[PDB]
């Protein structure tokens, strides 16, 4: 926002080393396009890497710029992990801001899930059936595990992803889960909780009771989001709280309203959803425990007697 942008030799990439390709999507906050960076590897400056570049539109606003800059600096602290879109570099000096991150060839989890066929056996009766390309219980469970494993990392780094949803989860060509779309994420180092503004820019159907009503964010608030994400994964792209408008959700939540167990979802996994949606944030599981439980669930689902 109208201020000098520092020079980071560590991540700065020569603007002439980035060959822009076609766009991968557009949003009111920015635009993402595919491309190729030359020599990201110092050991071999002649090696090309396929990357995704995050930039603003000609109609971008001041906020859109702060977000893009916030996402850059935030991805430097968090570090790198196999379950998150790692920062590869950026172009900050003399020209438009370009944030270079890993490329997910299979889109986000929402799209990814709605594109394939559900785990249920009944779908085999349909004329158009593709057994070779049909999601299974293990696949769904594994996705939740990988995202959990990812969030467990962010938490250890004292980082909060105030917006955890299927939309912000990409799938690589190897079907690997990678949490993405940082920007609203904030640091907790030296603090107990992050205070949000009166009206935030985060989906209400993914916000926790304490954050949505008391403007309080904690690693426990991200857990609540995770609970809603599980619902999506087991509904294969479903939309939280079906039929109920955002305006009426505020009241229901106070009365203790919660979503019902999705079809083709084991009670074992639904209890985890209700566990994450505990009224009291401290009473909710921790990403540390979730990875453990989800790990055991994967082991069982893999060997169901």
């Amino acid at each position: 926002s109208e201020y000098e942008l520092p020079e980071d030799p560590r991540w700065e990439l020569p603007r002439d080393r980035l060959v822009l390709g076609k766009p991968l999507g557009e949003g009111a906050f920015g635009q993402v396009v595919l491309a190729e960076a030359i020599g990201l590897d110092k050991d071999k400056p002649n090696r090309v890497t396929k990357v995704a570049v995050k930039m603003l539109k000609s109609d971008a606003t001041e906020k859109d710029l702060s977000d893009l800059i916030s996402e850059m600096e935030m991805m430097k602290m968090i570090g790198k992990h196999k379950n998150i879109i790692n920062l590869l570099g950026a172009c900050t000096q003399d020209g438009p801001l370009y944030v270079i991150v890993e490329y997910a060839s299979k889109g986000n989890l929402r799209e990814y899930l709605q594109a394939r066929e559900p785990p249920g056996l009944e779908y085999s009766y349909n004329p158009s059936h593709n057994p070779e390309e049909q999601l299974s219980s293990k696949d769904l469970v594994s996705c939740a595990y990988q995202v959990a494993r990812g969030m467990e990392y962010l938490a250890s780094k004292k980082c909060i992803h105030r917006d955890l949803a299927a939309r912000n989860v990409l799938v690589t060509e190897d079907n690997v889960m990678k949490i993405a779309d940082f920007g609203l994420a904030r640091d907790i180092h030296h603090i107990d909780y992050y205070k949000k503004t009166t009206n935030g820019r985060l989906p209400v159907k993914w916000m926790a009771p304490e954050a949505l009503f008391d403007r309080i964010y904690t690693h426990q608030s991200d857990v609540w989001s995770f609970g809603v994400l599980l619902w999506e994964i087991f509904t294969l792209g479903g939309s939280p709280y079906p039929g109920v408008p955002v305006e009426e959700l505020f009241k229901l939540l106070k009365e203790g309203h919660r979503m019902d167990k999705p079809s083709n979802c084991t009670n074992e996994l639904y209890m985890m959803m209700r566990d994450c949606w505990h009224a009291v944030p401290s009473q909710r599981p921790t990403f540390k425990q979730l990875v453990e439980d989800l790990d055991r669930i994967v082991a069982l689902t893999s060997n169901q007697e």
Side-chain angles (χ1 to χ4, degrees):
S1 71
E2 65 185 301
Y3 79 84
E4 299 296 299
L5 193 54
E7 173 71 303
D8 202 316
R10 292 282 63 184
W11 306 85
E12 196 64 46
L13 176 76
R15 204 171 284 277
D16 54 59
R17 297 295 65 180
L18 184 71
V19 183
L20 291 180
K22 72 160 190 171
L24 293 174
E26 298 183 303
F29 295 122
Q31 178 183 298
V32 172
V33 313
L34 176 49
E36 303 183 309
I38 291 83
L40 285 176
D41 183 298
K42 311 307 173 175
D43 182 62
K44 45 181 184 175
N46 310 297
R47 206 69 173 179
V48 176
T49 288
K50 184 141 58 184
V51 310
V53 192
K54 300 200 70 175
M55 57 194 67
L56 307 171
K57 293 186 176 192
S58 64
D59 49 58
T61 83
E62 298 170 293
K63 198 84 82 183
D64 298 51
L65 178 55
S66 61
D67 285 39
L68 186 61
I69 299 167
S70 184
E71 175 172 8
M72 185 182 77
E73 286 305 306
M74 178 60 80
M75 289 193 280
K76 297 184 194 183
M77 302 176 231
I78 298 164
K80 62 176 185 180
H81 184 276
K82 44 197 172 173
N83 290 84
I84 52 175
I85 292 305
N86 307 317
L87 180 78
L88 295 172
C91 300
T92 62
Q93 298 315 322
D94 317 296
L97 184 59
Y98 286 176
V99 187
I100 308 159
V101 303
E102 288 174 359
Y103 172 65
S105 70
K106 301 196 175 194
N108 70 55
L109 199 56
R110 177 181 287 174
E111 297 174 350
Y112 176 91
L113 290 180
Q114 303 170 317
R116 291 179 170 63
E117 209 170 4
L121 162 74
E122 62 275 9
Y123 296 89
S124 56
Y125 280 98
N126 294 301
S128 55
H129 184 55
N130 197 27
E132 291 179 55
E133 193 72 306
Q134 173 186 50
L135 287 166
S136 61
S137 307
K138 167 168 291 309
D139 289 304
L140 303 178
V141 171
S142 185
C143 285
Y145 172 76
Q146 291 194 273
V147 180
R149 199 193 180 56
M151 284 306 277
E152 178 183 56
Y153 182 66
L154 290 171
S156 71
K157 284 293 189 182
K158 302 183 190 284
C159 167
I160 282 187
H161 193 314
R162 297 197 292 173
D163 185 10
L164 180 64
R167 310 184 302 280
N168 309 310
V169 186
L170 316 172
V171 194
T172 66
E173 189 55 53
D174 305 295
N175 309 295
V176 181
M177 299 299 100
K178 285 184 170 290
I179 299 175
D181 279 315
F182 296 66
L184 279 55
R186 306 286 178 252
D187 192 41
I188 270 182
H189 284 292
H190 316 297
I191 310 176
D192 277 336
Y193 60 84
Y194 179 84
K195 185 78 173 311
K196 89 164 180 66
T197 55
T198 304
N199 296 309
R201 293 173 283 148
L202 296 154
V204 302
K205 292 189 170 176
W206 278 269
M207 279 190 262
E210 71 275 3
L212 170 65
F213 295 134
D214 302 316
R215 300 163 48 175
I216 297 173
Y217 269 105
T218 298
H219 296 297
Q220 288 307 75
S221 299
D222 274 1
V223 174
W224 175 290
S225 288
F226 180 84
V228 185
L229 209 179
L230 286 182
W231 199 85
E232 290 185 291
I233 291 175
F234 295 110
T235 49
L236 293 78
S239 300
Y241 307 81
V244 309
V246 173
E247 299 73 53
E248 300 297 298
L249 186 58
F250 301 143
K251 174 182 163 291
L252 294 167
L253 286 175
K254 287 181 177 177
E255 295 173 357
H257 175 63
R258 298 283 187 277
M259 296 195 265
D260 294 300
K261 185 184 66 59
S263 277
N264 294 316
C265 182
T266 59
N267 302 299
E268 183 82 57
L269 281 157
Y270 181 60
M271 297 198 99
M272 186 176 267
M273 283 180 256
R274 300 299 292 276
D275 272 29
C276 297
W277 305 326
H278 190 126
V280 187
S282 82
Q283 294 297 76
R284 300 170 197 146
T286 73
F287 285 123
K288 173 181 167 54
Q289 311 167 308
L290 285 186
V291 176
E292 280 186 55
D293 292 329
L294 273 167
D295 186 51
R296 179 183 52 76
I297 294 175
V298 171
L300 307 181
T301 294
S302 183
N303 293 296
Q304 308 187 319
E305 72 178 295

